[PDB]
Amino acid sequence: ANGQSTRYWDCCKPSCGWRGKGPVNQPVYSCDANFQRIHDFDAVSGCEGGPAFSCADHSPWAINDNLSYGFAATALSGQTEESWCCACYALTFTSGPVAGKTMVVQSTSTGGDLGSNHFDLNIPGGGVGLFDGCTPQFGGLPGARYGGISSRQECDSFPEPLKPGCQWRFDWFQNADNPSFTFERVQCPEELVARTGCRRHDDGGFA
């Protein structure tokens, strides 16, 4: 399948962090303002005035020069949230400085795009976007609302837990601006499920 991407980090509680969003052992962990995992999956989102924010460990990182693992808010053509929450997808970029590189992402939230295959990659400093839970969480992140910061140097002021994801963007990702890609769903590598704690029942069926 074919799709396109954007980048973002609004600190909001992931949409797949709620129970009943898919057939999983448990939903994606949420974290408190201090980036520590929360026991309560029913907790109110920080973007709703609550204490549940997005975990900094749900950040993209390089496996090797051709592959990275990550997370993203997803929207798949004619599908619903129940079919993509915690599901993983191998994306192969078809445009930008990273064309040819691959990135296995696990869908942890839902994007507000319809009639399209869109993956909004979780990238600390990539832009708060529509909502902004980062201001409430710790005073906010720098950068334009959409697109975020423009230089790696800008990551230096971010809270420590968010710096590596912020830097990944200018390194392995080579500051690629919304690259497109082909993709197929795949079994979630254990490293992803280990960060979110969320594994779908039908995952074993995908190789």
User: What is the CA angle 178-111-38, rounded to 5?
Assistant: 110
Determine which one of 10, 57, 132, 203 is catalytic.
10
The domain 1-207: what is its CATH number? 2.40.40.10
Determination technique used: X-ray
Resolution in angstroms comes to: 2.0
Indicate if 10 belongs to the active site: yes
3-state secondary structure the chain: CEEEEEEECCCCCCHHHCCCCCCECCCCCCECCCCCECCCCCCCEHHHCCCEECCCCCCCEEEECCEEEEEEEEECCCCCHHHCCCCEEEEEECCCCCCCCEEEEEEEEECCCCCCCEEEEECCCCCCCCCCCHHHHHCCCCCECCCECCCHHHHHHCCHHHHHHHHHCCCCCCCCCCCEEEEEEECCCHHHHHHHCCCECCHHHCC
Does residue 200 contact residue 24 with C-beta atoms inside 8 Å?
yes
Judge contact between 155 and 39, C-beta under 8 A: no
